């Protein structure tokens, strides 16, 4: 689906956490509800959602063109520490990534 745009980071590591079947389910869930994941304050509207069989995905939903940006995926307690500087970096990663599209 053209609805989901994977970051290079997301694409590298997705298969560690999700089978194709698990991933398509995740995509169907978001399509049904774009606001599914919880907002991460300080990041300009990035959202974080939990996934079982767990792991976490951070995405941005562009409502204008109905499109999801999948920034990253990781396991709980693996990279789960989030400070103020890390929130800023997610923004920079995002704002840089989303300007051209």
């Amino acid at each position, epitope marked *: 689906k053209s609805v989901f745009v994977e*970051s290079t*980071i997301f694409e*590298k*590591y997705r*298969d*560690e956490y999700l089978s194709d079947e698990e991933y398509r389910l995740f995509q169907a869930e978001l399509m049904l509800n774009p606001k599914l994941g919880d907002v991460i304050q300080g990041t300009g509207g990035l959202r974080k959602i939990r996934v079982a069989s767990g792991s976490r995905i*951070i995405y941005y939903f562009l409502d204008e063109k109905r499109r999801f940006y999948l*920034l*990253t995926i*990781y396991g709980k307690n*693996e*990279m789960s520490d989030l400070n103020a500087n*890390q929130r800023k*970096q*997610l923004m920079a*990663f995002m704002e840089a990534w989303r300007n051209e599209q």
Partner: nanobody
Amino acid sequence: QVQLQESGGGLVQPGGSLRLSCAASGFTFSNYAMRWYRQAPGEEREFVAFISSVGGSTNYADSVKGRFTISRDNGKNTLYLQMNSLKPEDTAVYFCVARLSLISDSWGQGTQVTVSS
């Protein structure tokens, strides 16, 4: 500069063993989970093994479980992959991989493993 430098690759008989090493430099190695990935000619790169920052937790691709062991030395800042009962299908370039944050990482240039009679 963050650097990962793999070594220990070789051309080895099926059934044999190898031990890959990855010498990490330029970052606080012990704070980061480490991974091995591999890539065969013409194929996509694939996950091989994962080890937690302290090294107590590990997990493996189904295809190598029970044959490969991932380990780390947090004083030498070195990551290892012990590979036993090697098969032709294990032939690939093996990569040391550090995820440095949620959105950044570093990959070694890789070491070549070839399993052939």
